[PDB]
Structure 1
Amino acid sequence: MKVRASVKRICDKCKVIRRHGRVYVICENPKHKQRQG
């Protein structure tokens, strides 16, 4: 998981979801998984 102030889509298959008051970015590629913070 990456934890950043700037979470962005990295590849066309990335997906910005919002869960529990937090912006995540989940994806098929494990490297792309992000959490804001």
Structure 2
Amino acid sequence: MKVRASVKRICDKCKVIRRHGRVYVICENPKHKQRQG
């Protein structure tokens, strides 16, 4: 998991979701997992 203030899609299989008040990026590539903060 990367943690930063600019969460962005990285590849076309990246998916921007929002759960429990936080913005996430989930994806088939584990390097692409993101959480804002």
TM-score where L is the length of structure 1: 0.99
Structure 1 stretches of at least 4 aligned residues deviating more than 4 Å after TM superposition: none
- Secondary structure of 2:31's aligned partner: helix
Q: Where do 5+ consecutive residues of structure 2 fail to align? A: none
Where structure 1 has 5 or more consecutive residues not aligned to the other structure, the ranges are none
Q: Alpha carbon RMSD of aligned pairs, Å? A: 0.2
Residue 28 (str. 1) matches residue 19 (str. 2): no
Deviations 1:12-31 (A, max 9, x none): 00000000000000000000
